């Protein structure tokens, strides 16, 4: 975790390695900011709704600002992300283009009115596939089971 305290390629695997040793450890300092800080960085890469809000009631460790910025990107406009940023201002962890990136993932349709509007080789669009597209994800779980062998070497 202290190595977790820039790059975002491995902050989540060090988040899995980080969020392990705290049955009941502290109430300030060590136990607190690892979870909420690392899931904030997990939004600094851009990971949105479905691990966020129902995973909150385990900690509930003063719980205002970072969750508020998570839905401030989950919606994704600068107008109320402003008052998340400037009106709070003490939230710390100071170290904008990402909530821009969310709304322009849509487009109006694709081009957006002859290359110009605002919101505020596999001819398919990226659904699934039976070639190189889905193969990457496939060999994810295979790798996991192989790495899970370690279990057999423990008795």
């Amino acid at each position: 975790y202290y190595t977790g305290r820039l790059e975002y390629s491995e902050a989540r695997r060090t988040m899995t390695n980080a969020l392990r040793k705290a049955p009941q450890h502290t109430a300030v300092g060590f136990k607190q900011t690892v979870h909420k800080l690392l899931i904030v960085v997990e939004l600094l890469l851009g990971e949105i709704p479905d691990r966020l809000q129902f995973r909150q009631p385990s900690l509930k460790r003063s719980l205002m600002p970072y969750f508020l910025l998570t839905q401030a990107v989950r919606t994704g406009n600068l107008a109320k992300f402003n008052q998340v940023l400037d009106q709070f201002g003490e939230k710390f962890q100071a170290d904008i283009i990402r909530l821009r990136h969310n709304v322009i993932k849509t487009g109006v349709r694709m081009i957006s009115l002859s290359y110009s509007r605002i919101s505020l080789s596999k001819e398919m669009i990226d659904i699934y596939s039976t070639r190189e597209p889905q193969l990457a994800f496939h060999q994810r779980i295979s790798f996991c089971l192989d790495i899970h062998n370690m279990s057999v070497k423990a008795m």
């Binding site: 193969l135 060999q139 192989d146 062998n149």
Partner: peptide, 8 residues
């Protein structure tokens, strides 16, 4: 993926 394709 022939190189890529531990189980034994």
């Amino acid at each position: 993926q022939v190189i890529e394709y531990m189980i034994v």
